Each structure stands twice: as structure tokens, then as C-alpha cells.
């Protein structure tokens, strides 16, 4: 039975072939058919083209060898090659043209998900072209996926050669009738059928895949829409920035370009942004995703003034000065879309722009103490219930599966009731000891949650709550100011606390701000619409924050 | 005695000021002497500026207040502001022009060295214009020099009001006799002096230094150069990245913009590039320095073919890819160099450039072995000691703070020869036990070496001489190639053992090559001559590597 897969790069996980484009390039050319083609393979093994796969000689210097092949060709063929005939301009074209073929990753990556060893084997060279970056850019997004990259110029052989084949078995760990080999070059097909190998001669993709799925009994055709790409916290860059001498902020970094900085809020992690950080470094932006202050490899002092929003938002800029960032956008969830409003109000200068998903800003009211605020509307009395030091702490430490299944739910998993906790004396005395799995969230990512907050549990986390008079004290400095620089709210349809109708006034403190809103959405929002997240980020990070 | 120093922004630590240039404003636009400057300041303590100052409003709010002020003086004055009139651009050109004036920034950081606790204090504004990172910048290269920085616009008081002073002693922990006061502005000195600090009313640069080093006691004019800003451990962002199962690397980074790796040679540390990693940042790069496989925080197996160059290059490419990053810079020094020019060589997709300080890229002999290569110069015969497990481990780590106190020394104060080092036994059979500290490091400086040694010792870092038959064979597969990518190699004038006449034939193998050469260098040269080093680099990295 199958258990691995391998994809060729050109004309299978990349389209067009280059193949493809020399015989689009003879037509606008008006040039004998196949003659740029027949150059490009000229001398078979013994050929420019050969050493070039095999990794003998770079890019740059087999561009001369072509041109003379190209030169010889037009010579046989008794036609002149026109005037301003490059091949660097038509090679610098054809591989800037190359994009992943999308329905082909998602297959791939769908046989990986179900247990295929994946792998991506290509004739491919070593590209010192001063442009060599965008080759490099779709190189990295595709290898991701992969178990292996198998490249001809890196191991010194070739397809057809019978030794890559081989070569490619062993790396596997799999016998010949345990791989899919995906191709299309019938030539390069032949050595892999000789051995024994399940081939699929790539023409069009959905007849590829139509194969593919019969062949492996896994759906890969009109399967529904997969989530984006998550994080697996082992394959991460864990940075740590030392703020104030017993303060440390731990952060997870992806991607290059300008500076994301994403925050979480409560009981979160850095990893609540799991399906947001590939995505955004995709995008063109370096992602610094932290654990806020209290949280995870973040410290968590236990006094509660060191959690007061002055202290958390002069941490930050620490944060930023530390790592040599004059600015970042700042993108907020929940607390740390509080923090967020906070940093544009306080130190604009900073933030290159701000988002919010959820937390509306709502600028403090001089006439009336932040609890009596609190209390005026009954969705809000969980956080009465966070204010006693150590009693939700006692609730929510007792058992930590339980805490974050029972917190992590879609809006049609309603298992908490946040109204009258204090009355009924808990967030859990009418929820289960052993909550369903929620549709958001496996058991693995629980168990992640679970393990982060075994460190520090929820003093610091609580803390965030405990600062009710202090943030209303500092808030009312800023009273006479508006928030002018880049911001986007986003509203979730279904968050029955945060709720999309508590954002209405913002244009009259925030007169440029631009909205988002995601419907069938609850309080979880990176989670629960992943890719609707994504959507929404990317569009107003490309127009707004550069 | 005097123990604090506290200088102004405008007109002190920076220039020119900001009433400066409105007065020549005034004098461009023809308008009476100070009708901006006293618009700028109507209604004193009650006025739209005060409430700027103070953070009560920010820039942009402010700005239509300042216009209604323009429009009100010229009615009163009985002029016309002329027709395309524009507050916004006069105080965004303004904003613009302002520098660091560095001979002050000089002297601050000596007062500061010799024990001084110094801050700057400013009325300064919450800057939400579109061009607010050109001062967000400005602030941030400024506040990394001082102890503290006191802002007008985050603690709500104002220059020349007695509070702002008050509250400027109880930050500093001094008594008024005890501080040093500079400013541009007699009215907001003289509540300073009432208050009993030393002032100095700041006009000339030049003037304002020779009372300040009068009456500190402390030379600050005809100063020699000092050397570049340097590196506190406990101060930069270290991060750490998962190679492989048992292998991780860490690295301090620090700024944004093109990705700059830097590589260490042996026996170092991230550390050896103190000098560089503050420039290069400044300079408009994100520097990701290095410790090397085998060093500091980085992971260090013992098997020696974990140290050939084929897997340390392999373990360089996965650290990009987990960072999310297609290409980096990559600069290397010794045994750093070396691996730069391979990753150049088998890897030129992934390197943006490729410089190499002292190690010169000399091809691989396929007629000859590396042995009988290293055998033929003298100045080599230390690399023949290090062939032999265990042996020189043992002379080195004996003494870690000898053995670095014997090495990072100037071609001056030469105290090893590295020919006959197997026939005399060691490297330090002729050395002091308790050798002199060199004038290129401190106690300190040398201690930290101390203590990243203590982790893995030197079996690591060691092993990457005893790979020389697995590089050769890997190499001589890059025989055919030509490195086309933009390099730069940088010869040290007094290096012994990598002499620069060993570079001499570079340019066959690398046609377009650049060069920098530092006169009176030994091998250590990040160190030896750090200012020159930054220069080299950082005109480089501007004019090839964007």
C-alpha cells in the first residue's frame, strides 16, 4: 500500500513549465518550433544543460553556453535569431512567471496529513542571478510542506538518471510499490515505472489529481475548504528581551519585512495566533507574536500593579527600544486589544499602525468609577468575579484540560453562561468535568495551552482585570486626544461579551478608522475564522501599514 | 560634587532648533521678526502649545490651533500670510532637519562612562503626523545613551514650571548641587539655577563643553576618538532556532531592514561582533549575530563530522528557513569566512552578498591533500596540533581566563608564535600564566568569553579543523563554479597567519569582487579596529546589498 509521495517542481507544484514558456517565446519569436527547447537540451548528458542540473556550474555561467547552442540551432536550421535575441531577459521571465499550482500543494499536503511521507524531486540549478530572490521566495514557501527536497544540483545527479530514483528510494525509507512518483515529462516518468512506482503523467491538474485520489483512496478533489497553515511551536525562532531587571517577554518571530507585533489576550498564548503568523510572513511582514506579560515564557510577577496598562505599554516600547524597532504595527485581540488602543494613544510614534479584534475603544468616563461601569451592564460580571485575588485563580488552576475546553468554543458550543457567576459562585458550576472537543481546537493544541500555564497559572493572567482604577486614572490623561494614525476594528457577529454593537461611537474618537467584520464568529476569533482573519489582516496591512 | 548631567533636545542634543527655523521661516516668507515663534507660544501657560507640551492634545490636533494663532498675529501685526501658508509643512521640514548634534552626544557618553547618572529632559510633543518615524528614530538612537528620558507630553508638566524640576531630582536620586544643567533657553535654566544645579546656557557647542568639562572635572573637548557603541548581553534580544532534533542555534539580533548574518571565527562569540552589531543596525539592517555550532548558547555535539562545512552550511540554510527568510547577508571572520564563501558557492539563492574579513576563498587542490597542503606553511602548523582529539582541549581549557587573556591580543603585543607549536608542545608552552590584559579588551570583555567557554569548552569549536578531508572532497564539487554574487573581501594588514597576500589570486574565482584593507590589524579585527571595520561594511553593505 501507497505511503509516500513525490512532485516535480516545473510543470507539476509550479506553473507554467519553463519548457512551456520557451515554446510560447519560439511562437512570439516567430522561430522554428522546438528550437529553443532543442538548444536547452543540446548534448543530452553531455551537455551545458546537464552540468547545470547537476550543480557543475551556476545559472550565470551556462547562460553564455545557451546563447552559443541557441546561436549553433538557428545555424542548422538555416534562420537568423532577431536582433536583441537574451536569454537572460527570456530565462529571467519564464522563472519570474513560475507560481505554485495551488490544487497540487493542497493535495500534497492533504496525503501528508493522513500519514504519506511527502517529497518534492527537481532538476533544478544554482541561481546567482541578481533577481535569484523570487526563485528563492517560492523555493521556501513550497519546502515548507515537504517532508524532503530532492535537488539535482545539490546532489549531483539527474532525472532520467537511474541513480536519483534510487537515491530518492533511499531518503524515502520506501520500497518502489509504496510511492506515487507525479511528473510531467513522460522520459522522467519511465525510470520510476521501471523500479516499480506508482506514476501519474501530469497534464492538466484535475486529471493528475483524479488519479491520484483513486490510487491512494484519499479524497483530494472537491474536499472542503482546509484551514491555513498553522505552527508547530518546535519549528519556531524563540526570541527573549529582558524589559526591567525580573521582567522578560518571550515572543515567536516568522518572515521579513516591516514589523507585526501581535497580542493576545485573556487566558491566551503567542499560539493563539498560530494560523495568522504563516500567513502575515507570507504576506511580506516580520510577525513578532508574543506571550504577554504573565503568560507562558513571558515572567509573571505576582504584584498586581505591575499589570496595569502604563506599565504593560512602557514594557512594550522597552520592548521595541531593545530590539532596535522605531515602530510596529500593533495588531490586538481581547486584553491585548485594550494594550493596543493604549499604545496609539500614548505613544503614536511607535505604532506604524493598530487593529483591534474585538475590543472596542471606548475612551474613559471622568464622572463615573470604572466598577460602577462594570456593573451597569450584566455580560460583564465575570470580571467582578476576577477581581478577589485567588478565587478565580482556585477555579481556573484546579483543572486545566477543563478550564481550556470549556473556554474554547465555537458560538454554537455555548458551555459557559457569564452572567451571574458571581452569583452562582464560578464560570464552571453548571459545565462538565470532562468537556467535548471543541471544532476549533484538537487535543494536541489543548494540551499546548495546558502545558504553557502550568509555569506561571493565572495570577498574572488575572491581574490584567485588577487594575480597574488605575486604567481609568491613566485613560482619563488621554481624553482630550484622538487616535489619527492607521487603526481597523474588526467585529465578531457572535461574541456575546465584546459584542459588535459596543464599537458604534469609535469614528467620533478614531474619525479615519476602517472595520472589518466576520459573521458566525464567537469570541475566539483567530481561531474560530482563521482564514477570514487572514483575509481581513492582509488587505488592510497592504494598504495601511506599508 | 557634581554626580548627574541632564541635557535638552532642541538646540542642545539636537540641531538646529526648532525656533531656529522658524525664524528662518520668518525671513523666507518676509514676515515680521517672530510672528511664528510668537504665535507658537500665545497664550503662555493657557495656550494650544502648553497643552501640546503637556500631552493633553497631540501634533495633529494641534496644528489647526497654531494656524488660528498665525492668522490672529498677522491681523494684529496689520500683514497678509502668504497664499499657500502651510503649518503642517513648516513643521514637518523642521522636524526633518533636526540631527543629533554629536560632539554633545560625545560628551554626554564620557560624563556618563566616567560615573555621571545622565538624562535628557524636553518639552516635546505625542507625534501622530504620517512622518512621525523620522523623530521616533531620532529618540530612539538618542535614548539608548542616557539613564533617563524625561518627555514633557508623558508626565504632563511643562518647562519652565518648578514641578517638571522637582520631579527631574527625584528621578536622578540628587541633590540639586549635585547636577549639571544644559539648555537653550535662559527662561527654562533659570528654574534649575533658582533650585541650585550648575547650569550652562548652551549657544556654541563649543563654549557650552568648556564650561561643562571646567566644572566636571572631566575632559570632554580634544578628546581621543572613541570607539564605537558596544554590546550589553543582558540588554540585546536573543534568540533561539531548532536546526535538527539535538541541534539548536541561538543569536542576538537587533534593527530592521536586509537581513545581516554574521558568522564568528575560532575560538569566539556572537560577542566578537560588539562593535558591529550597534552600527550596522543604525546603519538600516537587521544584524542576527551568531553563535557559531559549538559556541555559547548554540548547541555543541561532540562527533566531529557535526563541524564539516556541508552540514553546518545544510544547518545555516534550515536556520533562515525557520526564520522565514529567503536571503540574508552573510559577513564571516576566520573559520566564519570560510563558511560564508561555501554558503556563497552552494547556496547563492539564499545570500543577498558575501564579505569574509581575513580568510581569503582559495579553490580546493584535487591533486594535492589538505594535509599536505597545511604542511607546506609554518604559520599553519597550529592547525596539525588541533588534528588530535582531546589534546589541545586540554591546554585550553585549563585556564580559561589565560587562554583568552594569551589570544585576543594586537599585533603588538604579540605573546604566541604559531610555528613549531606540535614541537614545543602547545600553544602557550612559552606563554605567561597570568598574561597582561590587551588594549583592545577589558577584565569584563574577557570574563564573558569566560563564561560562555564554561558551557561546552572548546571539543566544538575545535572540531571544525578536523573535518579537512570531508570539506576537500565537498568542495572539489564546486571546482567549475564561479562566485557571481556581490562579495566582499577584507584583508588585515598584520595578520600572521591569514597574511593578506594569500587573497592575491581571489578575482579569478570571483571576477567582480570588491576589497577593504585595514592598516595595522592583526587577526582579531572586529576588535582591533572596530571603526574602521563598521566604515568597510557599512559603505559596502549601502552600495551592494541595499
Request: with cysteine; glycine share 6%; charged share 25%.
Amino acid at each position: 500500500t501507497l505511503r509516500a509521495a513525490v512532485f516535480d517542481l516545473d510543470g507539476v507544484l509550479a506553473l507554467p513549465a519553463v519548457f512551456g514558456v520557451l515554446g510560447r517565446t519560439e511562437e512570439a519569436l516567430a522561430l522554428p518550433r522546438g528550437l529553443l527547447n532543442d538548444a536547452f537540451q543540446k548534448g543530452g548528458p553531455e551537455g551545458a544543460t546537464t552540468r547545470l542540473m547537476k550543480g557543475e556550474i551556476t545559472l550565470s555561467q551556462w547562460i553564455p553556453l545557451m546563447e552559443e547552442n541557441c546561436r549553433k540551432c538557428s545555424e542548422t536550421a538555416k534562420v537568423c535569431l532577431p536582433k536583441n535575441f537574451s536569454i537572460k531577459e527570456i530565462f529571467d521571465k519564464a522563472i519570474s512567471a513560475r507560481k505554485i499550482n495551488r490544487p497540487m500543494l493542497q493535495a500534497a499536503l492533504m496525503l501528508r496529513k493522513k500519514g504519506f511521507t511527502t517529497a518534492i524531486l527537481t532538476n533544478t540549478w544554482l541561481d546567482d542571478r541578481a533577481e535569484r530572490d523570487g526563485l528563492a521566495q517560492l523555493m521556501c514557501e513550497l519546502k515548507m510542506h515537504f517532508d524532503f527536497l530532492i535537488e539535482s544540483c545539490q546532489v549531483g545527479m539527474v532525472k532520467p538518471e537511474p541513480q536519483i530514483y534510487k537515491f530518492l528510494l533511499d531518503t524515502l525509507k520506501a520500497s518502489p510499490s509504496e510511492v506515487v512518483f507525479l511528473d510531467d515529462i513522460g522520459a522522467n516518468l519511465k525510470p520510476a515505472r521501471d523500479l516499480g512506482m506508482v506514476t501519474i503523467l501530469v497534464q492538466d491538474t484535475d486529471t493528475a489529481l483524479k488519479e491520484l485520489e483513486k490510487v491512494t483512496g484519499i479524497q483530494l478533489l472537491n474536499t472542503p475548504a482546509p484551514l491555513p497553515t498553522s505552527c508547530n511551536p518546535s519549528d519556531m525562532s524563540h526570541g527573549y528581551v529582558t524589559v526591567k531587571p525580573r521582567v522578560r517577554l518571550h515572543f515567536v518571530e516568522l518572515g521579513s519585512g516591516p514589523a507585526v507585533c501581535l497580542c493576545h489576550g485573556f487566558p491566551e498564548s503567542w499560539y493563539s495566533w498560530r494560523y495568522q503568523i504563516p500567513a502575515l510572513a507570507q504576506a511580506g511582514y516580520r510577525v513578532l507574536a508574543m506571550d504577554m506579560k504573565g503568560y507562558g515564557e513571558s515572567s509573571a510577577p505576582p504584584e498586581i500593579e505591575e499589570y496595569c496598562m502604563e506599565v504593560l505599554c512602557k514594557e512594550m516600547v522597552t520592548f521595541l527600544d531593545k530590539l532596535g524597532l522605531s515602530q510596529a504595527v500593533f495588531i490586538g485581540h481581547d486584553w491585548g486589544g485594550m494594550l493596543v488602543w493604549y499604545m496609539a494613544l500614548f505613544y503614536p510614534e511607535r505604532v506604524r499602525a493598530v487593529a483591534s479584534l474585538n475590543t472596542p475603544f471606548i475612551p474613559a468616563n471622568p464622572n463615573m468609577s470604572p466598577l460602577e461601569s462594570i456593573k451597569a451592564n450584566p455580560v460583564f460580571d465575570y470580571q467582578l468575579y476576577f477581581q478577589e485575588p485567588g478565587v478565580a485563580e482556585a477555579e481556573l488552576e484546579q483543572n486545566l484540560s477543563r478550564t481550556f475546553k470549556s473556554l474554547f468554543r465555537a458560538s454554537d458550543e455555548s458551555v459557559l453562561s457569564m452572567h451571574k457567576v458571581c452569583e452562582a459562585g464560578g464560570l464552571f458550576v453548571n459545565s462538565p468535568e470532562e468537556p467535548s472537543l471543541s471544532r476549533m481546537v484538537t487535543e494536541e493544541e489543548i494540551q499546548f495551552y495546558v502545558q504553557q500555564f502550568k509555569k506561571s497559572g493565572f495570577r498574572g493572567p488575572l491581574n490584567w482585570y485588577r487594575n480597574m482604577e488605575r486604567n481609568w486614572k491613566w485613560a482619563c490623561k488621554s481624553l482630550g486626544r484622538k487616535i489619527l494614525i492607521p487603526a481597523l476594528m474588526v467585529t465578531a457577529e457572535k461574541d456575546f461579551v465584546l459584542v459588535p454593537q459596543m464599537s458604534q461611537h469609535m469614528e467620533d474618537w478614531i474619525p479615519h478608522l476602517k472595520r472589518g467584520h466576520i459573521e458566525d464568529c464567537g469570541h475566539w476569533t483567530q481561531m474560530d475564522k482563521p482564514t477570514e482573519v487572514n483575509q481581513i489582516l492582509i488587505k488592510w496591512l497592504d494598504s495601511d501599514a506599508r
